[PDB]
Structure formats: structure tokens, C-alpha cells
Design an enzyme around this catalytic site. Structure first.
Site, PDB file in Angstrom:
ATOM      1  N   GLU A 217       3.344   7.542  -6.572  1.00 57.77           N
ATOM      2  CA  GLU A 217       2.915   6.301  -6.004  1.00 57.77           C
ATOM      3  C   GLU A 217       3.642   5.244  -7.255  1.00 57.77           C
ATOM      4  O   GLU A 217       2.868   4.751  -8.029  1.00 57.77           O
ATOM      5  CB  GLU A 217       1.410   6.305  -6.275  1.00 57.77           C
ATOM      6  CG  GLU A 217       0.752   4.916  -5.990  1.00 57.77           C
ATOM      7  CD  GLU A 217      -0.610   5.122  -5.360  1.00 57.77           C
ATOM      8  OE1 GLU A 217      -1.151   4.105  -4.978  1.00 57.77           O
ATOM      9  OE2 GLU A 217      -0.973   6.185  -5.198  1.00 57.77           O
TER      10      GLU A 217
ATOM     11  N   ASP B 262      -2.527  -2.740  -3.286  1.00 57.30           N
ATOM     12  CA  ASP B 262      -3.671  -2.023  -3.056  1.00 57.30           C
ATOM     13  C   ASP B 262      -3.883  -0.816  -4.180  1.00 57.30           C
ATOM     14  O   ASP B 262      -3.368   0.108  -4.047  1.00 57.30           O
ATOM     15  CB  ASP B 262      -3.843  -1.495  -1.608  1.00 57.30           C
ATOM     16  CG  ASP B 262      -5.091  -1.015  -1.259  1.00 57.30           C
ATOM     17  OD1 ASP B 262      -6.182  -0.844  -2.203  1.00 57.30           O
ATOM     18  OD2 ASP B 262      -5.364  -0.967   0.037  1.00 57.30           O
TER      19      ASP B 262
ATOM     20  N   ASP C 208       0.722  -1.163   0.109  1.00 59.80           N
ATOM     21  CA  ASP C 208      -0.072   0.125  -0.003  1.00 59.80           C
ATOM     22  C   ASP C 208       0.765   1.214   0.060  1.00 59.80           C
ATOM     23  O   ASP C 208       2.268   1.201   0.115  1.00 59.80           O
ATOM     24  CB  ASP C 208      -0.921  -0.158   1.233  1.00 59.80           C
ATOM     25  CG  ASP C 208      -2.317   0.873   0.961  1.00 59.80           C
ATOM     26  OD1 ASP C 208      -2.607   1.028  -0.378  1.00 59.80           O
ATOM     27  OD2 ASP C 208      -2.902   1.358   2.019  1.00 59.80           O
TER      28      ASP C 208
ATOM     29  N   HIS D 299      -2.300  -1.345   4.775  1.00 64.64           N
ATOM     30  CA  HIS D 299      -2.751   0.012   5.000  1.00 64.64           C
ATOM     31  C   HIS D 299      -2.643   0.585   6.468  1.00 64.64           C
ATOM     32  O   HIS D 299      -2.512   1.566   6.735  1.00 64.64           O
ATOM     33  CB  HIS D 299      -4.306  -0.095   4.585  1.00 64.64           C
ATOM     34  CG  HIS D 299      -4.820   1.128   4.363  1.00 64.64           C
ATOM     35  ND1 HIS D 299      -5.264   1.688   3.046  1.00 64.64           N
ATOM     36  CD2 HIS D 299      -5.427   2.123   5.055  1.00 64.64           C
ATOM     37  CE1 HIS D 299      -5.815   2.783   3.075  1.00 64.64           C
ATOM     38  NE2 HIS D 299      -6.211   3.381   4.223  1.00 64.64           N
TER      39      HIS D 299
HETATM   40 MG   LIG Z   1      -4.377   2.459   1.442  1.00 58.71          MG
HETATM   41 MG   LIG Z   2      -3.164   2.522  -2.427  1.00 61.69          MG
END
Ligand SMILES: [Mg+2]
Ligand SMILES: [Mg+2]
Ligand SMILES: [Mg+2]
Ligand SMILES: [Mg+2]
Ligand SMILES: [Mg+2]
Ligand SMILES: [Mg+2]
Ligand SMILES: [Zn+2]
Lengths: 733, 733
Positions: free
Chosen positions: A573, A605, A538, A722
Site C-alpha cells: 500500500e 484515504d 484509495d 473507493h
Molecule cells: Mg478504500
Molecule cells: Mg485506503
DNA sequence: ACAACCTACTACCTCC
DNA sequence: GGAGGTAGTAGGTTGT
DNA sequence: ACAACCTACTACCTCC
DNA sequence: GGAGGTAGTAGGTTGT
């Protein structure tokens, strides 16, 4: 294990599909303006390759700059995504747009006023290819906007404006509606006084700003009268708010705004309890209401045009109806491995035996050998001084009852240490004050000299500045303190047998959280999956920086172990899988495990990027490990109008429903599984999602360690990645 | 203690100063364009308050938008900085600009060609107020620009271009000179192949890009012929480089550049040894050359106008000539505290006794009690496999000689542990290869199971990819390993008594670094300063992120202790002194020291911001500590043409020379001390720099722990805060 | 009208 | 901040 | 021509 | 990457 379900897709006419397309190359530089995507949208086309500036258009170009013909390919030679986007653009060209659909929908769902806000229906659209046909996916939503400006809302009073800005501190945003392009601004408050920064009596600047906005943006007769109707006459007795843009690049520029040209963004916080409940019941539609609305809309569309040739589409779904209690393991009656099914219980009734002898005793399964050699674990109780002298006593006696009951129930059967609570460990401080936090931290450092682990139960007020909370948690974490926070609203929740105890629901959850944070696993799984390691990944932003900490990988090695690792520090990201996997190898190298020749299942994710693909390919080529990657998506426009665990094989994706909604309002949101990939010896190949993979994902969706009534959607590695990236972002350890 | 010195300041005529100025307020929004500073420059004025958009102009405004008259004040009512900026702008209006001065200077220093680059003189200007008069400060510099494009430089050969781009990897930048605004681009290389990313045979795109640049930017007859003269005819047999802008926001956009419209930025790396030495001797002027050049320039200016009314200005300077050896403490002959002065030695001759018995024995002063209970300290030798089979043996035998001599010399007199070197601790690996690093890390983890501290001496090649270095250092730091790196060029340095040993200079530095990194303080200071705590603060960027780690504070509490702390994580360059000082209090609270009622001297590397001022005021008001702040500046335009330790009191600042240059080329750069502030009970007052403060700063400039021949400029806390923020930025521990 | 996604904040409803 | 769901509001990144 | 500063990279010259 | 000096090249932040 087969049921008919309804979806929000309608089949389109097959004569809309174009015959052949043209590929064009645009020769331009991206430091002059007019983004390529806007050009492609203008000429009714899409963008194939943004690096090479290649666009696809069903007609000849009408550009003004330099272009070059590249190819004349057929429609069927394109990948599926480009075909879907082209069909969406063509539908937009033929009048089937979100704006027209929403306008038609307003005839069946009129706008509704809630306090000072207005709610208006809205429809989002997508295109999906299935079975060689193209379907339009329609999603129902709402849009809430304010109707009165800030000056009209506060009632034209400076004290009211000051109180309104003070009360909604941190969750207030203003949008300037008197300019050409609307920007969202955040006000500025004094860093220590906690007051809004206004300009009290500067009527000259008020008049100058009013005339500047009048004679620059609304400089036409009908525009002038529209301006004077929307805003009215200038009020020279108004302050001036000093704010900054929400962009994260123009924050170094301070702007002066009149509290008459701006409107407040909607935050549920600006409504009382009755209106909040009404608006939340109004927005959260059920399956039948959505079906009826969509049916009426589709009938109105079909009676007006010939593009739609069907209605809500019925598909085939396979229903999971396995017994999960057979796979959950627990211990009872002095170390006897059993299952929840054989004890006629569920995951939710594993603390009921602590007070009633009718139900069987359910002991924990694995207590770590490290949480056995400790003689005593200090317990601290921190009570906020802003309570009402009764919530304080309730908090203390409830915490004492919880600790005492836990110790008494656990010490009878299984070995467990002494959670010693003492009158020297109860503190009543003001949380907002800064000196008290320092004194408390120094005292806790002094008291925990001859100790290793500590637990602190904190009772706070209804709302906190949202930075004092994080500071307190960080200060406790820095000295090895596990903190459990209960606010005032939860403490006001009452039972129905005796009003001197907390709600049984919240009590059980609190015991579960204490046991989980201490490190005790109350139950495990039984099943063997085909992989040796499962890695959940994540990414999150960095809390006041244009960087992305975005690094978290839970290797669920063992189904049991939960050890995390930090990836590092990125700019966007995009995980750096090369350094990540080098540290990956080094860590079990230090533990004594050879990460070579094994199989690893990676659950990301979001979506796997190209750079992560190349990194995984290189790592597989070098270290010789087989990699399996999956794409998990939580937010899309597709709805399955059913309430049961199932999975739908649509296009090249699998839409899973690993949970059942307990509330009486809302349509469950399915989880999209797509893009399964196998990397072997530096070669990346695509695969097909087998039923075993779906079963493994559904099984991983179980096994929550935060609540006993949890029905979480994501698999365990993704959810815990997460949470770990949450912890790293806010600085907790 | 009083000497006449020359500076680069000239007195200006007093009739240039304006009589009265006008203050104007601009009503405009900063999301439409035309920055306020550009406006103020257009109307011959300056910006007083950028938040309120207040500007000061010696004449009436000629703006087109909305403005309002604010005040009509006299010149003498302004602060000194605004007066200096106004005088600078007026001088620019009267023809005394940097461009004209540089053009005049070119008549005495003609441009010089070095290889493919050209060096041109340049002059920078500033204004300083002293004794009620205004002086123009002139600084001499040079500007180096390329004269041939990349295609002409490589000789019109694709192999040459590929080799040039491969060799200068990481230190290559291209500037596009065929567009209107020039942007600096960085090429793109394959992440694993280590090759430039070109486009070999795409002549159609080459012609299209050439015509696009021709018919968009140079679209006028004389412009057309200028273009064709500067670039020539299009070469269709050229590749296309794929690069990205150096901005740190447009990196997500890839641009295609012809290797004919770009020029290389200058990096000393693109010159051979002879030309590098010649250009460095040419750029680094001495005091006499600068004096002669400035005198000729000033004479030419005075013979042309009447603004300058003087020449190079003579000022009064106080010369420090104290004996620092009296303040340095050391131990000799089994724990006898002595000084360097009493032993007729210096700081530089404290290792000579290890081989010659003529000089006295100088033992260390304080060995930490933690580096005494260790029985053995493992020593590892890592030799790069890319050497020439002779540098390898030289590296091993030199490292063994250093360790053996250190142990034999130290064990005779003072207690010291065993730095055990073994044949199982010598590794020869390829540093660039990734598998070898993982294997080495695993082996080092396995070998250091029953150990606490370890030391590794690494021998590398001449140049490394600059990320493998940091990765190796981080991997060693993660397992408690102090690493000392010696490259191949240093190993090629020869002595003059026997060619089988390293240079005595480098040897002594190496033992000093080993002893310092281990934690042994070879010498301390004697003097008492009036403060209990001195805190040095610095800020650095975040290594591929738009954030600023920028957190480092060395509290030099004790002059001895050196403990650092991390401030945190910021968005710009502005320390959060509130959280910093809360952690400040908490840390010596856990140590057992009450940080209340004490005095703290804060040395900031740069300038104290307003937010830091408010934070310090709040902290002093709450926790009751007296704060003293100083501003230290290292880069300005003022030069003192002398080579001796002194200080000059100019305007409201003190220009210190805490060092003497050892080389025969270059003018020493003084250190600016300014803006001394005292914060007491939340009140911030200004003070005057006393001679004691200058003495304390000069004393702190001594006591280096990295080299024995150091003559560093900054004080110790600031220098070590810089090093600590270095360590945090690159991830080392 | 760039489309698909992901953050960060909210708020109510349910569980042995 | 009992934790999981579902609603909204603004912001960013990636396509190849 | 926004001015004063600060980064990140370079490269040679000197020391007992 | 012996470390301190001094030279250059591009980028960012703060004024109030
Ligand atoms: Mg997340
Ligand atoms: Mg994510
Ligand atoms: Mg929690
Ligand atoms: Mg700095
Ligand atoms: Mg620095
Ligand atoms: Mg070093
Ligand atoms: Zn940014």
C-alpha cells in the site's frame, strides 16, 4: 456555535511520566528470530527507528545479545507519538491494561448467550496528549465466540453436518481449538458438484488423528483431564473435513480436520431473524448507555488506585449550522437556475412532483451533450427463473412502471431520448447455469449491433454465489450495458397505499441511480474552493493475489467533474506518485491544460507514506506545482457523545462530524483530519488546519450521486476513489 | 529416413531394482515443521500422495511420530515416474550421486580461472525407463563462483566500491558468506540521485557487526582460525551497504552488510569483452567434446564399480527431410500465388530483389483490407541525445533510406499507402530525463489528431535503465504507435561494400519487422491439419507482485490467423479453463461462429495441471467440443549428439529436433512431447503420438513472423502466446 | 500482549 | 444486490 | 541433497 | 534494444 460535549478520555496522574529515557541500538539480523518489537516490549520500551534497530527504554537494558548505548535524552525531547506510546506502555506496566479493564467491566455487563454464541464486553485503550496533559481514551466493544464445537452444534449427525456446510458456503470458517496455536481454516467444496469434500468412513484415520492430538498437545495429567472434559470421548462415526489455512501462503497445503476439534467463527449469517435483531440491538449501544457504563467503570477504577485523577472529560466544540441548500443548484421551469432553499424543499424531495401537482417541478441541471444525440436507448429486463412466478410479474411490471414514468415526466419539459422497452428484450434465465449466461451474452451482442449505449434492469434471488453476480456485471459491461440489480428481498418490500407498487423510497432511489449511471447530474454546488484540482486516492487488494491493484485517483477538476484515473499496480500500500503524476500531466496535456504553476489538494484515504512524500516533493520540484496533502482517518478509539454536526480541535488533529445518525441505536463515529502538509519547490513543510479547510471538507462531504437520502461521511473524491478501485478490483471495465 | 544416434544414457545393472515396497501413511500437521519430502528422503523412499501423506519405501520405516501401514505392493505395480524416482534414490544410496560424479569429472576437466571467477565442472543425473530397462542419463554443465570478496575485488577503496555499485545497477547481487545459511541480497540505491546508499563513517557499527559475526557463527578454535584466514583482520575504514533480501517476502526488511563478508553473484556483465568471449567459448561444448568427456567418465566409473553395464547408448531415430518450400505460399508478378521452391529461392532471400535485378520479384501475399484505405501513415524518428553526433546522423539517414526504399519498391507493383516522413517528425531528446518524455508525448498526441496509425523508429544508447524503455514503449502504445528500436551497438555494425549503410542482414530484418508489426503477412502455409482451432497457452509472473498475470491464449483459427485473448489473473501457474472457455465461446459467438461440435488442439507451454484437466472435462461435457491436449517441455537432461532434423521415440515421449544450429559451438536442445490426451463428453483418455502429430508440430515450428533467418524451436502458437504474455506483463496495451 | 490503521465479508435501520 | 449509516469476524501494511 | 519444470535477467554467434 | 539459437545466476510452482 459553541457547545459543551463529553468524550471518553480521562486525565492521568502526572507522576507516572518518566524523567529521562535511554536510546539503545540492537545488533542482530532479522533472519534468526525474536522480532525487535517483542524485545522492546519485554524491556518495557518502544521502537524509535526499526531500520537502525533503535529502541527507547526508561531503564537500562537487560538484553542477552549485542547492544550499544546511543543517547540519554529527556522525555520532552521526543515527538508526541513516541511519548504517547511510552505512556501507554508504562500504564500497562502499572496494571491499567485492556484485560484488567474488561474483567472489571464484566461485573456490570454479564456475558450474554445468543443461540450458540456468547457475547462478552471488552475495552480498548489509547493515550492522547492535549494541553500538556496526558489522557487515557477508553473504547467500549464486544466479543462474540462460539461455545459448542461443530459436532455438538450439528447434533452428531452426518447429514446435518453436510447441510450446514452446504448452506453457509463461502461464509464459513473453522478454528482448530485442540492445538497449541489456533489457525482459521476454510473448507473445500467440489468445484462443480457444489458439495463439501469429506471422507465418509475412515475410522482408522479418525482414531489416529484423535490420538495424535491427545499425545502431542495435552500430555499432562491435569491437561489430559482438561482435554477429556472439553472434547469428550472419540466418536469413530464422524467424517473428516478437508480444509486449507486462511493464510494466503499456506493455501497450497491441505489439512484434515475432525469436526470435533474445531469451532465455527461467528458470522451473522448463522442466526435466525429474531436472534439477529436482538444481537444487533444489544451490540449497538447509544450515547447514554456508554456514558453510564464508562462512569461506573471509572468510579470502580478510581476507588481502587490513584492513577486516574478525573472522569469523562468535557471539551469545547464548534457546531456547524450553515444552510447547505443555499449552495445546491438546480433548474426548474424550463432552464432557470435556482437553489433548493428558495423552493422550500430539500435534496430528498426532488422526485415527488412526478405524481403530485402540489409540489413544484424540479428539472435536472446539466444533461451531457453526448446523452442528447442518441435516438433510442435499448432497455433490457432480465428476470431470474428461480423466483415464485409472482415476484417475476411484480419485477417486470415495476420496471415497466419506472421506465414509463421516468420517460413521461422527463419528456414533457426537457429534451430526453427514447428508452425503448420491447417484448423482445425480456429474458428469463437461470443465473447459476453457465450455458444460459453464454446464450444471453451472445443474444445481447447480436441485438445491440446498431447501438451505442444500453440499460439492463436485472432481478435476482435473495442470495447468489457472489461470483455469478460479478461475472454477469462484467459480461454486461464488456458490451456497454449499464446494469441495475434489484434482489428478491427488496421486491418483497411493500408500500402502504397500494400493495401493487414498490416502496416509494426504493423507487426514488432507483430513478436516481438510473439517472446517475446514465451520466445526468441532477444538482451541483455553488462554492469556490481555493484549489484548481482535488485528487482523492484509495487502495484495495487484488482479489485472489498477494498483489495490490490499489490504484485509483479521482481528479475532481471542474464543483462538478468526476473523471477518474488508474494509478497502476503495486506490491503493498504505497502509491507511486511519480508515474501517477507523469500520467496526471499527460492527460490534461492531451486535453489541452497546462498542469504547471497550479495548486493541487490531495486527499488520501488513510495515511501518506514516506515514499509518496518523496515522490510528491520530486514532482513539485520538477514540474513546478504546489501540493497540499491531508490525512483522513475513519477508524479510531475516540467517541464524541453528541448527535450534531460539529468539529473538535484535539491535540494536533480535527475530529469532524459531517453527518447525523438517523437510527435510534449507535454512536456516530467521527472523522479524523490530521497531518496537513504543503510541498513547494521540493520543500515539505507542515501547516495548521484553518477553519476554511474544515468548511471545504464539510462541503465536499455533501453532493452524493447514489442516493437522495444519503448522509455519507467521507468527502466526495475519497468516496468515489473507493468506488472506482472497487470497480477495478472486480474487473468491471 | 533412419539414422543411428548417440545419447547420454547408460544401462544399469538389473539387480539394483528392489523386489517389493511398503506404503506408509504419516499422521502429522504441516504447521510444525520437518517437511514430508525430507522425511521420505531420510528413510530412503519417495512420496506417492502428498495430500494424504503417503510414502513408498523399500524397507520398514524408522519414524519417531505416528505412522500406519497401508499396503505391501510389488515394484511393477507402480507407475513409471515413481519407479524412476525410486531407482534414482537407490542409485544415490549406492554412491552414484551428482557430487561423486562431479568430483570424478574434475580429474579430467580442472577448474579454470576467468578474471575473478572460477569455473568448475558439474554433472546432473536422471533415470529413464525404456524397453523394460532402466538407464542413467548424465548431463554435463558448469558452475561459476567468485573467489574474492567485494572488498578484495574493489581493491580496498571506497571510491572504487561506489563506482562498481553504480555501474552494475540492476544486475548486481551479493551473497553473504559469513553466516550459516547464505542469502542473496540486492543493494539499495537512491530513487532520484541514482547513487548507492552507504554509511560512510560509522566504524563503531563496523566493529560491532564484525564481532557479532565472529562470536555467533564461528565460535570454535578451528572455526575461529578458519574465519580469520578466510576474511582476515577487520578494516574499520569500510562503508556499510544497506540491502534487502531477494526473497519476495522479506523485502520489507533492510539489512546492513559489511562489504567484506559478501561475494558478488556472477553476471556476464562483470567481465570485459575478451574474457566474456573466452568463457562463452569454454562453457558451450560441442558434441564430440561431450562424447569424449562422458566416455572417459563412464570408463572410470565402470573400472570402479559394477552398477553400470554399458556405455553411451545408441538408439533409432527417424530423420525428417521434407521440402518445406513446397508448403510456403507467396505472390509474385502482380498477384500470382506461387511457392518458394518453384522460384529457386528460400525464405531468407525475399528482399534481395529490392536492389539487384538478377533475382525475381517476390511480393507479399495478403495485405489486410484495413491497411489499404489509409491515405497517409505518419512516420516519426526519435534519436537519443546521448550519442556522438555521428551515430545520430547515421541513424537518421539509415531510417530515411529504409523507409524510402520500402515505399519505392512496394509502390511499383502492389497498392500501398504513403509512409510520409517530415522534418517536423524528427526529435532529439534525452531519454532518461522525465520532463522530455512528457513533452514528447504531448507533442505526439497533438500531431496525431487526424490520424489512426503511426510508426516510430527510435535510436537509443547501448544500455538503458530498463524501465525507461518500457515507459517509452507504453507511452507510444497508448496513442497507437508501432515502435521499432535500434540501439547504438547495432548502428555500429558495418557492412563490407560501403561503410555508409547498415548491415544488409539487419536491414532485411528491420523491413521484415516493420511489415509484420504493420500487419502484413509476407507468406503463409499450404497444409491442412485435422483440427479447426489450435490454442497455444503460456504463463508469466506479474512484474513486482506475488501474483501471476499468466494469461495468454493464441487461437490460431483460420494456417494463418493469429488473434490472441487474455485469460485473466491467477495466483499460481494454473489456467482457469472454465472461464477461459466461456470467453472462448463468447468471442466467436460475437463474430458469428458456433464453437460446438468442433475439435480443438491445445498446446500448453509446460505441463497440464489437474485443475486444467477438470476444467477441460467440464467444458467438453457442457458445450460438446472434443479437446486434444499436448505437453511440451523445453528443458530436460537428455541430449541427442547429432545436428539434423529428426525425432526419437523414447519411453512414452517423442524428442523432436525441429531446427539446426548455425553456430560452431553448442549442442542442440531437443523438444520433449509427452502426455497426449483426448477429452470427449467429459471423459479423459490417453492416446499415442502418431507420426501425423509430429509432422504437424514440425510444420507449426516454421512460419516465423519476426525474422527471415529464424530457426525457432517452439510451435508458432506457443511462441506467440509467450510474446503476448510478455506484452501483457510489461503493460504494453 | 507491537500500535494504528486498512481490507474483505456480514447483518439490521432509515429515508421525500 | 436501493444506498448510506453502525456492529462483529478473519487477514495484511507501515513505522524510520 | 525433493524432482522436474517454469520465470526474470545476462552474454556471444549467425543470417539472403 | 535485428531476432533466433545456446551458456550461466538467483527465484517460484506442482505433484495427489
Ligand atoms: Mg478504500
Ligand atoms: Mg485506503
Ligand atoms: Mg450499486
Ligand atoms: Mg510457461
Ligand atoms: Mg513463457
Ligand atoms: Mg523486439
Ligand atoms: Zn506472497
Amino acid at each position: 456555535m459553541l457547545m459543551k460535549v463529553l468524550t471518553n478520555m480521562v486525565k492521568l496522574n502526572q507522576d507516572i511520566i518518566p524523567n529521562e529515557i535511554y536510546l539503545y541500538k540492537i545488533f542482530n539480523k532479522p533472519e534468526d528470530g525474536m522480532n525487535i518489537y517483542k524485545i522492546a516490549y519485554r524491556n518495557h520500551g518502544i521502537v524509535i527507528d526499526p531500520q537502525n534497530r533503535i529502541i527507547a527504554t526508561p531503564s537500562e537494558l537487560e538484553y542477552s545479545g549485542k547492544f550499544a548505548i546511543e543517547d540519554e535524552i529527556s522525555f520532552n525531547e521526543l515527538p508526541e507519538n513516541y511519548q504517547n506510546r511510552l505512556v501507554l506502555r508504562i500504564l500497562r506496566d502499572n496494571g491499567i491494561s485492556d484485560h484488567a479493564l474488561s474483567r472489571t467491566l464484566q461485573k456490570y455487563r454479564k456475558p450474554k448467550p445468543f443461540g450458540d454464541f456468547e457475547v462478552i464486553p471488552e475495552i480498548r485503550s489509547s493515550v492522547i496528549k492535549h494541553g500538556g496533559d496526558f489522557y487515557l481514551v477508553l473504547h467500549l466493544s464486544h466479543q462474540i465466540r462460539s461455545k459448542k464445537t461443530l459436532w455438538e452444534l450439528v447434533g452428531r449427525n452426518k447429514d446435518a453436518l453436510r447441510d450446514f456446510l452446504k448452506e453457509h458456503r463461502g461464509t464459513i470458517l473453522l478454528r482448530d481449538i485442540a492445538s497449541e496455536h489456533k489457525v482459521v481454516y476454510k473448507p473445500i467444496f467440489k468445484r462443480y458438484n457444489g458439495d463439501p469434500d469429506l471422507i465418509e468412513d475412515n475410522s482408522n484415520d479418525v482414531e489416529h488423528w484423535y490420538d495424535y492430538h491427545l499425545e502431542r498437545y495435552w500430555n499432562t495429567p491435569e491437561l489430559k483431564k482438561e482435554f477429556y472434559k472439553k472434547f469428550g470421548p472419540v466418536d469413530l462415526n464422524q467424517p473428516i473435513i478437508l480444509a486449507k489455512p486462511l493464510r494466503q501462503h499456506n493455501r497450497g497445503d491441505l489439512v484434515h480436520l475432525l469436526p470435533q476439534f474445531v469451532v465455527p467463527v461467528y458470522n451473522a449469517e448463522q442466526l435466525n431473524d429474531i436472534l439477529a435483531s436482538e444481537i444487533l440491538e444489544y451490540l449497538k449501544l447509544t450515547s447514554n448507555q456508554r456514558i453510564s457504563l464508562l462512569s461506573r467503570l471509572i468510579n470502580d477504577i478510581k476507588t481502587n488506585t490513584n492513577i486516574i485523577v478525573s472522569s469523562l472529560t468535557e471539551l469545547e466544540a464548534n457546531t456547524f449550522d450553515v444552510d447547505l441548500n443555499d449552495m445546491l443548484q438546480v433548474r426548474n421551469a424550463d432552464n432557470v437556475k435556482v437553489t433548493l432553499s428558495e423552493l422550500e424543499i430539500s435534496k430528498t424531495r426532488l422526485f415527488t412532483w412526478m405524481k403530485s401537482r402540489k409540489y413544484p417541478v424540479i428539472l435536472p441541471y446539466d444533461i451531457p451533450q453526448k446523452l442528447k444525440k442518441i435516438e433510442k436507448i435499448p432497455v433490457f429486463i432480465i428476470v431470474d427463473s428461480a423466483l415464485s412466478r409472482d415476484i417475476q410479474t411484480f419485477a417486470k411490471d415495476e420496471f415497466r412502471y419506472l421506465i414509463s414514468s421516468l420517460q413521461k415526466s422527463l419528456s414533457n419539459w426537457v429534451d430526453f431520448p427514447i428508452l425503448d422497452i420491447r417484448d423482445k428484450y425480456i429474458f428469463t434465465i437461470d443465473l447459476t447455469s453457465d450455458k444460459d449466461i453464454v446464450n444471453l451474452s451472445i443474444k445481447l451482442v447480436n441485438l445491440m449491433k446498431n447501438a451505442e449505449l444500453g440499460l439492463a434492469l436485472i432481478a435476482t434471488r435473495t442470495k447468489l454465489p457472489n461470483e455469478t453476480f460479478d461475472e454477469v456485471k462484467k459480461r454486461l459491461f464488456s458490451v456497454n450495458i449499464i446494469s441495475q440489480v434489484v434482489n428478491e428481498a427488496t421486491l418483497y418490500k411493500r408500500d402502504k397505499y397500494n400493495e401493487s407498487r414498490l416502496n416509494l423510497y426504493v423507487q426514488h432511489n432507483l430513478l436516481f441511480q438510473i439517472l446517475s449511471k446514465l451520466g445526468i447530474k441532477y444538482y451541483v454546488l455553488r462554492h469556490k474552493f481555493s484549489y484548481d484540482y482535488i485528487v482523492g486516492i484509495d487502495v484495495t487488494p487484488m482479489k485472489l493475489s498477494h498483489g495490490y491493484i490499489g490504484g485509483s485517483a479521482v481528479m475532481f477538476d471542474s464543483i462538478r467533474k468526476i473523471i477518474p484515473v488508474e494509478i497502476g499496480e503495486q506490491m503493498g500500500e504505497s502509491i507511486d506518485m511519480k508515474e501517477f503524476f507523469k500520467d496526471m500531466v499527460v492527460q490534461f496535456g492531451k486535453f489541452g491544460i497546462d498542469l504547471e504553476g497550479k495548486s493541487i489538494l490531495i486527499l488520501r484515504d488513510g495515511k501518506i507514506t514516506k515514499d509518496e512524500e518523496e515522490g510528491l516533493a520530486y514532482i513539485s520540484k520538477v514540474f513546478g506545482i504546489k501540493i497540499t496533502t491531508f490525512n483522513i482517518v475513519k477508524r479510531h478509539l475516540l467517541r464524541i457523545f453528541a448527535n450534531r454536526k460539529l468539529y473538535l480541535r484535539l491535540a494536533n488533529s480535527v475530529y469532524l462530524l459531517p453527518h447525523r445518525i438517523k437510527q435510534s441505536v449507535g454512536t456516530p463515529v467521527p472523522l479524523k483530519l490530521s497531518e496537513k502538509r504543503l510541498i513547494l519547490d521540493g520543500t515539505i513543510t507542515s501547516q495548521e488546519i484553518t477553519y476554511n479547510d474544515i468548511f471545504e471538507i464539510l462541503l465536499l462531504s455533501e453532493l452524493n450521486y447514489g442516493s437522495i437520502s444519503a448522509d455519507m461521511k467521507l468527502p466526495a473524491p475519497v468516496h468515489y476513489a473507493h468506488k472506482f478501485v472497487r470497480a477495478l478490483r472486480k474487473g468491471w471495465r
